[PDB]
Amino acid sequence: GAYKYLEELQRKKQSDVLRFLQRVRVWEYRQKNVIHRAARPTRPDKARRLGYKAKQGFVIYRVRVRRGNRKRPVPKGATYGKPTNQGVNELKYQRSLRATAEERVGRRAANLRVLNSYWVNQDSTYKYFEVILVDPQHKAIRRDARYNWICDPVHKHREARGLTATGKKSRGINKGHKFNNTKAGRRKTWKRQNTLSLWRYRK
Amino acid sequence: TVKTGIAIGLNKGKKVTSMTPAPKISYKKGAASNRTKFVRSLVREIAGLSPYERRLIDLIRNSGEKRARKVAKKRLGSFTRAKAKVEEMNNIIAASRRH
Amino acid sequence: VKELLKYSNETKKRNFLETVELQVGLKNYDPQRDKRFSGSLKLPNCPRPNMSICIFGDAFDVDRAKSCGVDAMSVDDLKKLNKNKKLIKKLSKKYNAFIASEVLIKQVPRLLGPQLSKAGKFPTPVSHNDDLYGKVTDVRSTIKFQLKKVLCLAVAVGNVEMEEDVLVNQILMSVNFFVSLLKKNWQNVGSLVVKSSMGPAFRL
Amino acid sequence: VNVPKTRKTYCKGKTCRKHTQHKVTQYKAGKASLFAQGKRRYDRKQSGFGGQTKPVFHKKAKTTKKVVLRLECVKCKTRAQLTLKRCKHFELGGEKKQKGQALQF
RNA sequence: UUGACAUUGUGAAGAGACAUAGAGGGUGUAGAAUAAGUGGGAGCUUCGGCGCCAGUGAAAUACCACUACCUUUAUAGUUUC
């Protein structure tokens, strides 16, 4: 078996071979468009444990996201309010850049459905990811019961409702005592304990 | 860990005939199999060393394990990781450059 | 393992060409500081003799100058004082007591130098002379830590078979490691360059 | 003003319970250390936007400070604190004022 | 606006020291004798020769080693300029 070797090689990033490959590929990917098609998964291991089965319908896209904080709008810096809220430069945009990549390729290939995604590369200006989209109307995926749950219409834009891999992190959804503000969802657990419940026979 | 029978003290608890059941098969998740050892050794000898590992095998031969732990904790997260990483670099220097 | 090399054993017996008693020498390696109170300051009992010649200048007193005429090397007194301060050097190590501690200020310029006297470390002024003489003529080791990092001692003779010398290098490993102070490093068995007197060095 | 550098006063020590000698020093504020609770909380609240949060003082008028003397016993070397009134020129030294000698003008 | 880190690589200079050997260097008294210290130790080589002893000094040697001390990089990769 030889995905274990790719797995462990990809775990050794700043070694001399992988930083050579990382430099050639950050050059090559920077010379193409912002969102373009990956003909073949550049990491068959990491694509393969996220649900890629190489047959007709699975598509990889490769996507550049601009990298850094979020300079707020509201022009010439004036927020018009309390000096609590007077920041511009240092505000940090709660969704990860991996989520922005998934959402943008979700809009551009709107017939397809995002499945997960994975990192590939970064310089200072850009992060490059690959998204592992599925074409749900294709007959190879409308059959084959391990992957036909994507065909159901509740998974339209899993990427935009935080339902993907990096979404459920960015929503803070895990079990624990460290996720009490967002465990079943942040606003449902807000609203269920700002709701005054009144009975008929008031206790 | 026989509980003493009273409400407080050294072993706090009720006397209960115990069972010590069959083990779950995890509690053994991290233990590396023969295939994992061969693969990780092979990729370690292909891949070489990352540059902070080169600067740590610098400091172990030159300045010593105290300053190596002081850099490796700074270069990584936790101090318990700076233990095992400097242990790895001790094994790397000792098993190779001696003979 | 200590079995592949010689280290006390039969393997290094024909390497040296001198057919005289050539003793094996073990060197410990542990980085210590420059101080004098740290390190392994102890000389234990060596169970097999080192097979050396040593004569004792027993300058004893009333209660202890009688047990030297049975099992000892030389019988001396405190009256013979004009020899051990000027001329004579025919000795290897002495043996004294606690009953006469005012004669010790006189034999210092000649015998403290080449290790023929006692200062603070070796069990030379031991009072008992009826049982400790079955331990000093069977010649012991020499645990003496130097300035930066070395510990040169002697275990036994290379011509001695590997049957007497099987629990001697093991009992000596438990002395420089367990009387060890906390100014010693990890893997105190770090480097053991063992050479006897003439042949090559056999290390672990 | 002036005080003696020694003072035989009461000494609670569980072994003294009596007037012993005490050496007398003058009190210092102390090094304003981090990692105490209020400085940690203050340094968290000051983080980010908002500006100055906890109120900062401008209005002082008391020209002096009350002076605290640190008494130390000499047997059990425990420490007691003691206080004075407000005073401008404080010294713990000697040179007791004389019996009215020749003033030299 | 100014600094640090990242994007950020490859050659050629000047010093700090490590894989990797070895030539030599290291002169306050005394002591055949330049013993920077230690361990074994009365002998080795066909012989010669030195050595044990003797004497000396804080240190006794012929013979094999460790730490070291100042050079020497000719062999390999890292440092701040």
Side-chain angles (χ1 to χ4, degrees):
Chain A
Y3 297 108
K4 192 64 179 291
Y5 293 99
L6 266 78
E7 165 176 347
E8 198 69 33
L9 272 169
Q10 196 66 36
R11 283 183 175 178
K12 267 75 178 175
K13 281 185 174 62
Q14 297 183 1
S15 61
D16 296 332
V17 49
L18 271 82
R19 60 189 289 164
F20 172 71
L21 267 72
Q22 183 174 2
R23 191 181 300 171
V24 176
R25 286 178 181 174
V26 69
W27 182 74
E28 182 174 3
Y29 297 159
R30 192 161 61 241
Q31 285 291 319
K32 288 186 178 181
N33 288 334
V34 172
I35 291 169
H36 57 81
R37 189 186 175 93
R40 193 163 302 171
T42 53
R43 291 169 64 193
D45 49 352
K46 187 69 176 173
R48 184 173 166 84
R49 65 180 54 89
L50 294 173
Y52 190 87
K53 312 302 287 184
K55 61 182 174 182
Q56 294 195 357
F58 287 88
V59 176
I60 305 296
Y61 268 84
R62 188 182 296 117
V63 44
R64 297 156 54 198
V65 290
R66 184 62 64 93
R67 166 179 162 86
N69 287 319
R70 182 183 185 267
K71 180 176 181 174
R72 185 189 284 167
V74 313
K76 287 182 279 188
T79 301
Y80 292 156
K82 302 286 182 66
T84 297
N85 296 314
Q86 204 178 356
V88 168
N89 281 321
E90 287 174 346
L91 284 92
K92 294 190 166 75
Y93 182 60
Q94 306 294 319
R95 285 174 68 88
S96 56
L97 274 71
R98 181 178 171 183
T100 296
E102 296 179 356
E103 189 176 2
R104 291 185 182 182
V105 300
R107 281 202 298 273
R108 193 167 182 270
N111 51 356
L112 266 58
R113 300 283 176 84
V114 175
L115 187 57
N116 284 317
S117 66
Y118 56 89
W119 186 83
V120 303
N121 203 345
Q122 62 183 359
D123 58 347
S124 77
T125 313
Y126 282 138
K127 287 193 178 186
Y128 307 157
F129 296 90
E130 282 177 347
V131 193
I132 193 163
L133 299 91
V134 186
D135 182 66
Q137 72 269 5
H138 197 272
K139 293 287 188 181
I141 301 104
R142 291 177 68 86
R143 304 167 191 170
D144 194 11
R146 292 182 182 91
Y147 294 103
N148 62 359
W149 53 264
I150 197 70
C151 297
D152 187 76
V154 309
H155 304 98
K156 298 183 185 180
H157 288 275
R158 303 178 70 245
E159 63 274 13
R161 304 185 287 125
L163 298 172
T164 57
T166 189
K168 290 172 95 286
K169 183 76 170 182
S170 299
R171 296 164 60 186
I173 297 175
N174 290 311
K175 300 190 181 182
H177 67 280
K178 297 183 183 295
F179 312 95
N180 282 323
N181 296 319
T182 163
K183 185 170 72 176
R186 192 185 80 190
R187 306 184 190 183
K188 187 174 73 179
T189 196
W190 182 70
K191 190 173 177 185
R192 79 184 182 188
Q193 65 198 5
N194 279 318
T195 288
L196 179 64
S197 178
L198 300 175
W199 292 102
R200 308 168 79 193
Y201 300 135
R202 304 287 171 89
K203 295 179 73 69
Chain B
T1 65
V2 174
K3 299 295 195 293
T4 53
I6 66 171
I8 51 172
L10 186 63
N11 291 319
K12 172 159 64 182
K14 175 70 181 295
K15 287 183 66 63
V16 161
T17 166
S18 64
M19 287 183 68
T20 175
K24 288 166 67 71
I25 54 153
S26 64
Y27 303 126
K28 289 183 181 179
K29 190 183 179 186
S33 68
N34 299 319
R35 182 177 179 85
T36 56
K37 295 184 178 69
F38 171 61
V39 168
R40 290 175 189 169
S41 176
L42 185 143
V43 181
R44 188 61 168 173
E45 64 190 1
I46 291 173
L49 299 178
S50 70
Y52 81 102
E53 300 166 347
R54 294 189 182 98
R55 289 191 294 271
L56 286 182
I57 61 98
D58 287 330
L59 296 184
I60 290 172
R61 291 195 300 272
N62 287 319
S63 179
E65 295 177 354
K66 184 175 182 291
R67 186 170 171 84
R69 291 170 184 265
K70 187 169 72 69
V71 170
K73 188 183 74 67
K74 184 176 186 178
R75 188 62 64 197
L76 303 183
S78 303
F79 179 73
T80 176
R81 291 181 175 181
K83 291 180 185 181
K85 192 68 177 179
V86 176
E87 178 67 29
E88 180 180 2
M89 300 303 154
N90 286 318
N91 283 320
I92 288 296
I93 299 171
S96 176
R97 290 183 180 92
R98 300 292 180 182
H99 302 290
Chain C
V1 72
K2 59 100 177 179
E3 193 175 3
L4 294 174
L5 74 159
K6 175 253 179 64
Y7 182 76
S8 182
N9 287 318
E10 195 269 331
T11 305
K12 193 271 299 294
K13 288 175 70 175
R14 66 179 65 88
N15 294 114
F16 58 94
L17 294 175
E18 302 184 355
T19 176
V20 74
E21 293 176 353
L22 295 182
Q23 284 66 231
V24 72
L26 191 147
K27 294 184 290 294
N28 292 111
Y29 183 78
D30 198 356
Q32 298 180 2
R33 297 282 80 79
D34 194 75
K35 279 82 174 175
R36 300 292 184 183
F37 60 93
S38 66
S40 179
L41 197 149
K42 187 177 180 181
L43 182 63
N45 204 170
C46 189
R48 297 295 183 184
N50 204 6
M51 295 176 70
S52 178
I53 181 65
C54 60
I55 188 167
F56 294 97
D58 294 331
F60 288 159
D61 203 76
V62 177
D63 290 331
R64 289 178 179 90
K66 190 176 180 180
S67 178
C68 294
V70 176
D71 186 74
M73 295 301 292
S74 178
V75 177
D76 291 331
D77 287 327
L78 294 173
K79 184 174 71 68
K80 274 77 69 178
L81 185 63
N82 297 114
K83 293 188 288 185
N84 289 318
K85 193 177 179 180
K86 295 182 184 293
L87 183 62
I88 192 169
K89 298 295 290 185
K90 294 190 286 184
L91 69 155
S92 178
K93 61 181 180 180
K94 283 187 178 182
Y95 187 81
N96 213 168
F98 291 104
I99 189 167
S101 296
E102 65 183 1
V103 191
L104 191 146
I105 200 166
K106 294 181 183 292
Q107 293 180 356
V108 288
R110 297 291 296 163
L111 300 175
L112 185 63
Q115 191 58 254
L116 301 175
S117 178
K118 82 288 288 179
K121 290 183 181 180
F122 293 100
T124 299
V126 177
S127 295
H128 293 89
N129 54 5
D130 55 355
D131 189 74
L132 272 298
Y133 285 163
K135 295 179 181 179
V136 295
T137 185
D138 291 331
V139 179
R140 294 178 181 176
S141 179
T142 171
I143 297 172
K144 177 70 175 179
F145 60 95
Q146 290 296 109
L147 294 176
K148 298 290 185 181
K149 47 180 76 175
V150 77
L151 184 60
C152 293
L153 55 89
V155 175
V157 184
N159 284 316
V160 176
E161 295 292 327
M162 63 179 288
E163 293 180 353
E164 293 181 354
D165 293 335
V166 72
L167 295 174
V168 185
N169 55 0
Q170 184 178 1
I171 199 167
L172 192 144
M173 185 178 70
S174 176
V175 176
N176 294 318
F177 182 75
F178 291 101
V179 192
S180 67
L181 198 64
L182 294 175
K183 196 59 72 176
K184 294 187 186 180
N185 303 117
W186 183 253
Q187 57 183 356
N188 300 115
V189 184
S191 179
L192 294 176
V193 178
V194 177
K195 190 191 75 70
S196 65
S197 68
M198 184 66 201
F202 289 161
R203 65 175 292 163
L204 182 62
Chain D
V1 301
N2 190 1
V3 288
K5 286 170 70 68
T6 57
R7 182 188 179 97
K8 281 188 284 295
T9 182
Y10 187 78
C11 174
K12 55 182 181 180
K14 298 293 287 186
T15 58
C16 295
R17 289 177 181 173
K18 69 182 180 180
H19 290 82
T20 72
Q21 194 71 57
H22 288 80
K23 296 178 183 178
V24 171
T25 63
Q26 187 182 1
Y27 181 70
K28 187 187 173 184
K31 188 176 183 179
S33 178
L34 288 168
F35 288 149
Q37 177 65 43
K39 182 65 176 173
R40 293 177 290 134
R41 186 187 295 116
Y42 178 80
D43 290 331
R44 176 168 175 81
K45 178 180 276 195
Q46 287 301 118
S47 73
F49 301 102
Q52 177 60 49
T53 65
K54 200 68 72 79
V56 173
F57 197 81
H58 294 293
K59 289 180 179 178
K60 67 186 77 175
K62 301 290 195 296
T63 59
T64 58
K65 296 184 178 71
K66 285 186 176 181
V67 177
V68 174
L69 296 179
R70 189 182 186 92
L71 300 173
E72 185 181 3
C73 178
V74 300
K75 297 293 178 66
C76 66
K77 56 190 173 293
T78 192
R79 283 165 177 160
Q81 285 183 353
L82 191 142
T83 182
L84 262 59
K85 300 185 186 294
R86 299 176 186 268
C87 61
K88 287 181 182 178
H89 287 282
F90 185 76
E91 65 179 3
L92 50 87
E95 296 295 326
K96 293 185 175 185
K97 286 182 176 67
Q98 296 176 356
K99 299 293 194 295
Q101 295 294 321
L103 281 76
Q104 295 88 20
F105 298 101

